[PDB]
Design a protein around this ligand. Structure first.
Ligand SMILES: C[C@@H]1O[C@@H](O)[C@H](O[C@H]2OC(C(=O)O)=C[C@H](O)[C@H]2O)[C@H](O)[C@H]1O[C@@H]1O[C@H](CO)[C@H](O)[C@H](O)[C@H]1O
Ligand SMILES: C[C@@H]1O[C@@H](O)[C@H](O[C@H]2OC(C(=O)O)=C[C@H](O)[C@H]2O)[C@H](O)[C@H]1O
Ligand SMILES: [Ca+2]
Ligand SMILES: [Ca+2]
Lengths: 884, 896
């Protein structure tokens, strides 16, 4: 028969790297081109392939591919897909106890139960270089009021271990993913029930001794659980190794490395030999002692032996480093520095060893690294994701309620700090955070140049990506954007400006930390020259008005590394820390506030899977994000437990059991719809359900009289249908407009759902959408002639310009296009003749020098960028017509 | 009849923008002015710090009140009594514009500067009762010392669960209070103890002395806080601080103000209840007013959507800044205990000031000079939503890991002198059981207190923070110091020889390098700041921080003398600062101030107290003399110089030669004690000569010991070449060593004898004694200077053996220089220059540059000079300075 074939080409995200340890990348395909399992793939050899997404007709939409570690590194990789009629391997082995993965360079064994995540790590030769990878956690039960209170407020410490429940394996030749889940169980200390659920993923690639370790946790503790240390630990066997042949290294600042031995032979009073000393520094096995100069070799007993080393990064700006002969002795402080790049190695020239490290180490402070008992038969190497040298992690609420009593008071407080408080809602119960850890194995102590390289690898892991242009052709990732007229040029320069300022504010406002890193804030205080870190709703942004959409689309269009890294970090924060992953509110995220979990507005607009979609697919179906997207399918359950509109709805409705549940058609539904469309696209375990709930609710909305202009609907949790809201039992017509409904993914989700449903789209839905896009900011007359009232509380007109643009493009209407551009250039948001620059502030006005743009807030820049991107993609033809 | 003369004094660097009154030193030519018959005027409060042998003023101190009028220079004219007693001119007596009064009763001392009144209880657990402004308004109260500690430490973080910690809290308990009152400045010295407040019974410990300098017309108070470490293996300091209450009862929350000094002139500016950056605007002027620390307008004039809702704007009671490394600080606030802390955008290096007060109540600022260089440190505001806030400076932060001063090693199985000396051969450490103890070390901290009648501007706070981190200093001209000869004859000003000019460039090279190494190698810390290391590890590209005696330098080969003489010759600010900090470390932390070894200091090692050589060459008060006089008799150093007069008693408890001596001698009770004539005696002599110069309470004693020991060395057959003697602690006399009871003649040479301040003390001593110099001493000193590097035959001829283990030829070149000056022997002067340019130490063809190192070889990038060690630079620079001074007439001659 026929052959349908095509090529697609994948490039390195920034500069071509000098080292990579295997990579997984994604590739989109046009609707209807290639059948799954039928279509073969080759790289420029056979190429590890698998599907992450499917079109509605079940053809391939996104794939994921993997290549082995190789020192041949090319500029472009070309994947050729060929249909049915056209013309280095990992070895996993199974025992009763444990599963072994062997890449050709390392063999790592994962037990199937117990408190040891990794049994041992061997190199090619077979020598054990590390053993007993284990999770550590320690906690306390009280916290003292202040430092003075420690004398009359005892502390009870508890250590814990990772206990395994399930081990899963996804084996291919090129890469194997081991997924280990469990809980943290007590060991020593005061007694405590199992808590702090974990999942730890291990990506092994063929021909690599680098292991990427995605480590995720859910906080399920309460008010009395104060995390004290969090980390990963290995034993490093040293027994047959002369102390002068045992090596310690830490990564330093930039490309630095600290280079010591457990028994130092350099810097002594006597010279063993110039060759010998240079060998120690180089991590080499020293010559036989018979060649040393005897005034040294006869005196080794008098040269101290250094068992413990500890690096502590407690601010984003400074680290301490210290070492100790053994316990019971004081530590000797070591010359330290600002920002450790966050890798440590323990091992030997003969026995080999292990480096462990954390990506973005100092940006996720307080962290640390420990070598211990390096004078013993077995040393330990520990990575602290949270350091005990830091203050205990206190997630409890930042204020006590202020004497607020009921919805009247809370809504009043809302008018001043923009925080909508409620008791019991200011809770971290069920948040998460994923930490990207790296293990490197070595047959012998490696060179310093090598450790610095693997350190830099870790902090900027190579990424392969599709050409932006190719992505656009396929329509596999939205149609609401195009690739980058003098007027348009200054739109792009303005997006560049927004991006440069936000990337800059991360550093200047010091938006780093275990949980904080990734987010940014909402509104600025012009008097104090700070962002409003301490005023209610004006603090951490938590995806308010879809900055996630802006930043990801900004990456798609450009292919910029900086863009990808900014959006990646954002995604790793807002998807983990700003949403609940367990409990009654599971699948909701929390409105912008002072803590990431302080506000009472738990809503699906924060936990909005559209925000993670672009990263899910571009990363090659990142499994952690995959898991997170599956969690959000239980978001509909919450409307039975919690009414997001509970404080302000006027119609007397409340949730009862076995009843229908209310939700908005823009805010809430946009998040549900997107969850359902992603699962459908993925064909996951719950895809038939997802297709039914999306398909029904769409038909629901079409068969409402006023369509989207209806405020909300009533949804059935058992039958999965959508009917009129409480105050219109007979679907005669309700009008309830909100300025929030469109700005959290609605148009993006709807355009994707319309395209995906193809000829099966419920009659009149597309037109109900066009009706919203058209009449939101039409004249009050055109509104009263259509729905009987004019739309009262309209605002965000710049932000809604991209709706007019959608309708304009789709209805081929040049008049509407000009109204869209008029709304963009001459309503609100960021006017074109606003200051469009930064002002520098220093001296006694501020703690440190900063750049500011008091004239913008994050609500403005997110919707400005989305408007620009979308207005240009839909109606750049009418832009020149608008300027003249 | 009349005798009058003038001396000018300059600011150390640039003219300051503010000062808070200042003290300074001035020297006077031998024999010119009598004490108590000599008046001083400024173009002035005055008192003597030092005296010449005939009782005429050698050094004086001088004090000026705070003034808005600041000059580029200041001239003190002295005048004998004859100048007024002879003239019949009628002249006006008028009060000074400002002048301190102190009222004194059994309860409490009160000091009033005209700008503040502060009260010092005479007993109790509260150092300052309260602080009032001009108006009478109380701005702060119950100034108190705090201390916190723990009874043990876990092996590691895991071990917390099985190793419980018993926390204790302590207070400063007052025992004595003193006053040195004068019109323009007043000094309250307060001595005490720390006693338990919370936790199990603990004997009183951690002796303190705190000194408050108050100046006329000044609301600024300088504070020298000194503590001695008398804990044991179980006492882990955790928390060391100074706390005040600030009365806020009566200030609206939105008129209470918090300020922290940030980085490079930055200030953090907040209110306890913030009116800025709310959803609603109370009015532009009102916000502008809050950020400025001004009292806000009446609530009735605001936009009412804010005044209705103040109840819903949280209130911030606690603020905490922590500087737990030299490179980064944290900053956080919270509503009240039982809530979490909210994090605040922070940064690198905080300049160490916090203010708490209000627009109406006024308030207090407190800070630590050199804050981040002395990490770990902190500042806490407490309870600023209550009737009473607390403001606290932490000299040691509880947020740091506890201070552990125990040994770094267990001894490594060394059993006795033979094993200890064999370990000396490889790490350069001289270990001994129980000798590795911090028992009796001290540390002084320079703190400031600022009273405000109302929340001050931010410009003012930053201006005061800068004041505090760079306190203005008034010094005499180098020329004048040199002319008076009041601080040694062994240095002089920077000659036209091109060779001399490359010597000067090389001392600038050394200084600039040592200055940068402090920052590059992060030699900062609560106890470390001020010291530097001893030898380098060229492979690892670090100083040998982890190898015996190659780590902290502890004044080995007298770097303190080089850096002080380098300041004297030049007037350089950086130079003064380098040396001041050095002196503040070396004479506090590197020496013991109580116990059996009182008045010894510790030999260079991995800890400041690790090594077993406990010796007077470290405590060596010659190392503090130049600063003692230049500061205007800094009273804490003054005090330290007094303790060292007890040094001679140690020779009965501890032999420094115990391990190496071959003569079978040991101390025993009521017996003559053995000490060295070079290293040990130069420490002793220096302490005695200073007590004599000061006419302090032990001067007659001091004069006798110095004179008798000088006389005793004179009477030894081979004088200095003998090595040591036997000192009688009752007759204060010096006889020959145990191997030579007949005084027939003994010979024992060490390369170390001259390089710990001997030639400096000996010359000063010789000029002090004048006509009453014991017979044959100058000759014995000349003999040593000449014979050291004379020929082997010359030595054999005078003393019966050649001198076999002589080294440090460059270092001793200055002895030949001195002898060449005193005998006017050109040929000997040329020897001095030959040993300088062509023996050891730093040769003129040494690399004489730095190499930059980076990438994966090191943690951070560093500049190195592997071709030098501190021993080398300290003696090179003394050689340069002393050879130029004695024998520059012969330098061009050498170069041809
Ligand atoms: C006898 C003592 O031995 C060691 O504690 C130490 O000497 C070693 O270190 C040094 C040094 O740091 O300067 C130099 C020596 O070559 C090493 O053995 C002490 O310095 C030393 O005390 C002194 O001993 C000599 C004995 O000849 C001098 O008399 C000197 O006056 C002593 O104070
Ligand atoms: C019903 C919810 O009520 C509040 O918790 C929130 O609303 C306030 O917040 C915002 C916002 O977008 O952050 C805008 C409103 O104008 C304001 O009153 C939620 O947004 C509501 O859905
Ligand atoms: Ca967040
Ligand atoms: Ca020292």
């Amino acid at each position: 028969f026929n052959c349908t074939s095509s090529s697609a080409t994948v490039h390195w995200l920034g500069d071509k790297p000098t080292y990579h340890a295997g990579v997984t990348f994604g590739l989109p395909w046009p609707q209807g081109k290639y059948r799954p399992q039928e279509t073969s793939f080759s790289l420029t050899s056979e190429l590890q392939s698998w599907a992450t997404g499917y079109w509605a007709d079940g053809s391939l939409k996104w794939t994921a591919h993997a290549i082995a570690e190789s020192n041949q590194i090319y500029d472009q990789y070309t994947v050729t897909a060929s249909s049915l009629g056209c013309v280095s391997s990992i070895v996993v082995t199974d025992n009763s106890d444990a599963l072994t993965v062997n890449t050709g360079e390392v063999a790592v064994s994962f037990p199937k139960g117990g408190n040891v995540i990794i049994g041992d790590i061997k190199t090619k030769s077979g020598k054990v270089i590390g053993a007993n990878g284990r999770l550590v956690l320690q906690s306390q039960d009280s916290v003292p009021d202040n430092f003075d209170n420690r004398a009359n407020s005892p502390i009870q410490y508890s250590n814990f271990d990772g206990n395994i429940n399930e081990v899963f394996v996804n084996q291919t030749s090129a890469r194997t993913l081991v997924t280990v889940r469990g809980n943290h169980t007590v060991t020593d200390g005061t007694d405590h029930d199992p808590w702090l659920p974990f999942v730890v993923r291990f990506y092994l690639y063929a021909n690599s001794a680098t292991i990427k370790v995605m480590h995720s946790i859910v906080f399920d503790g309460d008010e009395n659980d104060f995390i004290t240390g969090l980390g990963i630990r290995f034993d490093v066997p040293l027994k047959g190794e002369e102390y002068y042949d045992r090596h310690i290294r830490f990564a330093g600042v930039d490309g630095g490395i600290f280079n010591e031995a457990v028994q130092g032979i350099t810097g002594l009073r006597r010279d063993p030999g110039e060759e010998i000393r240079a060998a120690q520094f180089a991590g080499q096995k020293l010559a036989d002692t018979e060649t040393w100069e005897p005034r040294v070799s006869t005196r080794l007993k008098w040269i101290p032996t250094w068992a413990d080393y500890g690096l502590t990064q407690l601010t984003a700006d400074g680290f301490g480093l210290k070492k100790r002969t053994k316990a019971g002795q004081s530590w000797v402080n070591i010359p330290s520095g600002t920002r450790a790049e966050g890798l440590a190695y323990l091992g030997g020239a003969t026995q080999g060893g292990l480096a462990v490290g954390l990506r973005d180490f100092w940006k996720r402070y307080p962290v640390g690294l420990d070598i211990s008992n390096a004078a013993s038969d077995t040393g330990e190497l520990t990575l602290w994701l949270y350091s005990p040298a830091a203050e205990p992690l206190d997630l409890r609420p930042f204020h006590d309620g202020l004497g607020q009593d009921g919805y009247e008071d809370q809504l009043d407080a809302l008018e001043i700090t923009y925080e909508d408080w409620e008791p019991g809602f200011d809770t971290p119960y069920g948040i998460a955070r994923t930490s990207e850890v790296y293990l490197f194995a070595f047959d012998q102590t490696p060179t310093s140049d090598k450790l610095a390289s693997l350190t830099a690898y870790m902090n900027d892991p190579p990424v392969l990506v599709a050409e932006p242009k190719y992505i656009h052709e396929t329509q596999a990732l939205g149609e609401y954007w195009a690739l980058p007229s003098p007027a348009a040029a200054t739109l792009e320069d303005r997006l560049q400006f927004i991006f440069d300022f936000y990337k800059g504010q991360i550093e200047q406002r010091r938006w780093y930390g275990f949980l904080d890193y990734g987010d940014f804030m909402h509104t600025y205080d012009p008097d104090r020259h700070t962002w409003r870190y301490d005023v209610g709703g004006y603090a951490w942004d938590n995806s308010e008005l879809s900055p996630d959409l802006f930043f990801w689309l900004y990456f798609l269009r450009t292919g910029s590394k900086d863009a990808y890294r900014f959006a990646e970090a954002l995604t790793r924060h807002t998807g983990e820390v700003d949403v609940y992953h367990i409990g009654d509110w599971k699948g909701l995220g929390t409105r912008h506030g002072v803590q990431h979990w302080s506000d009472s507005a738990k809503q699906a607009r924060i936990s909005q899977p559209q925000y993670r979609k672009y990263f899910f697919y571009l990363s090659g179906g990142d499994e952690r994000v995959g898991e997170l997207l599956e969690e959000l399918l239980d978001t509909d359950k919450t409307y039975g437990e919690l009414d997001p509109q509970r404080k302000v709805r006027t119609d007397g409705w409340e949730p009862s059991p076995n009843s229908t549940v209310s939700f908005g058609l823009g805010t809430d539904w946009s998040g549900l719809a997107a969850g359902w469309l992603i699962e459908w696209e993925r064909r996951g375990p719950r895809w038939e359900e997802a297709k039914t709930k999306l398909t029904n609710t769409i038909a629901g909305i079409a068969n409402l009289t006023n369509g989207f202009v209806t405020g909300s609907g009533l949804y059935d949790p058992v039958t999965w249908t959508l009917g009129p809201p409480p105050s219109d039992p007979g679907n005669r017509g309700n009008v309830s407009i909100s300025h929030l409904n469109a700005v959290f993914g609605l148009p993006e989700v709807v355009s994707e759902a319309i395209a995906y449903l193809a000829d099966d789209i419920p009659k009149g839905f597309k037109q109900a959408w066009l009706d919203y896009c058209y009449y939101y900011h039409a004249s009050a007359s055109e509104q009263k002639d259509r729905y009987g009232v004019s739309f009262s509380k309209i605002s965000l007109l710049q932000a809604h310009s991209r709706l007019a643009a959608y309708a304009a493009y789709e209805t081929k209407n040049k008049t509407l296009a000009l109204r869209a551009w008029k709304d963009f250039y001459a309503s609100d948001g960021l006017l074109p003749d606003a200051p469009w620059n930064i002002t520098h502030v220093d001296g006694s006005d501020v703690l440190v020098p900063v750049d500011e743009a008091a004239w913008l807030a994050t609500n403005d820049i997110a919707q400005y960028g989305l408007a620009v991107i979308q207005n240009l993609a839909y109606v750049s033809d009418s832009l020149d017509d608008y300027q003249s």
